[PDB]
């Protein structure tokens, strides 16, 4: 499709992060109501999740048992809600400052981008240890997105270029986006395809594995957008922060 569709989300306020599982089911962080909501694929009912004590959420992401992270941003913490029990733990990242951006593997490790501290941060499952990745020169960094390689991309927003370390290399990238202005939300496909929300802009980029030369998707109206998530079937969702809805194109 060439034309976008508003998910029937109700009563969002700056919303912010987004993502989607296989299913079709789409969560988003209603920032502004200290809330997560999520609506299944041809639903007309959302359904806003047990979180408690949120503030100002940001990034969420979902695991394939159905654990849901929430980058708990104005409490500097990251929150896991585990599947069925609804048990909410805090992960024991530590040092965190305006956290925003948070990614999630198959393996469970967790990447946080702490916001306020310039860097990027990982957590292996039931682990003591977080590592720094060495990003260099990072200003206010909102999304992170992880590949199925383990290569980690992050929207370096301050900077208005995003930024890629490839797995056991030293060495970041800069993708050569054009025209980016405090870009926000970064997701990337199985294809390594890499789509950014291009807020400053108003618009959502996409890159081609193998590719220099940008396509901007057929969004109209974005205002402020900042999530984006992209499915297995190509479909890709967008939090249109300054509208207070979330809208999506297929494929």
Request: charged residues 5%.
């Given at each position: 499709s060439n034309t976008q569709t508003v998910l029937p989300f109700t009563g969002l306020n700056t919303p912010s992060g987004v993502a989607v599982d296989s299913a079709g089911t789409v969560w988003v962080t209603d920032h502004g109501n200290n809330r997560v909501v999520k609506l299944a694929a041809?639903?007309?009912?959302?359904?806003?999740?047990?979180?408690?004590?949120?503030?100002?959420?940001?990034?969420?992401?979902?695991?394939?048992?159905?654990?849901?992270?929430?980058?708990?941003?104005?409490?500097?913490?990251?929150?896991?809600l585990a599947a069925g029990s609804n048990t909410q733990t805090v992960l024991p990242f530590t040092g965190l400052n305006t956290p925003s951006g948070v990614a999630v593997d198959s393996?469970?490790?967790?990447?946080?981008?702490?916001?306020?501290?310039?860097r990027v941060v990982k957590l292996a499952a039931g682990s003591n240890?977080?590592?720094?990745?060495?990003?260099?020169?990072?200003?206010?960094?909102?999304?992170?997105?992880?590949?199925?390689?383990?290569?980690?991309?992050?929207?370096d927003h301050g900077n208005n270029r995003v930024v890629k370390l490839a797995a056991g290399?030293?060495?970041?990238?800069?993708?050569?986006?054009?025209?980016?202005?405090?870009?926000?939300?970064?997701?990337?496909?199985?294809?390594?395809?890499?789509?950014?929300?291009?807020?400053?802009?108003n618009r959502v980029v996409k890159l081609a594995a193998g590719s220099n030369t940008q396509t901007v998707l057929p969004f109209t109206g974005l205002n402020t957008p900042s999530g984006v998530a992209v499915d297995s079937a190509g479909t890709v969702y967008v939090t249109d922060h300054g509208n207070n809805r979330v809208v999506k194109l297929a494929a």
């Open positions: 041809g639903s007309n009912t959302q359904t806003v999740l047990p979180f408690t004590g949120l503030n100002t959420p940001s990034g969420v992401a979902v695991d394939s048992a159905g654990t849901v992270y929430v980058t708990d941003h104005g409490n500097n913490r990251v929150v896991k393996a469970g490790t967790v990447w946080v981008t702490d916001h306020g501290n310039n240890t977080q590592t720094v990745l060495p990003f260099t020169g990072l200003n206010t960094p909102s999304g992170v997105a992880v590949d199925s390689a383990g290569t980690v991309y992050v929207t290399s030293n060495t970041q990238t800069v993708l050569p986006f054009t025209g980016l202005n405090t870009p926000s939300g970064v997701a990337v496909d199985s294809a390594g395809t890499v789509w950014v929300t291009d807020h400053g802009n």
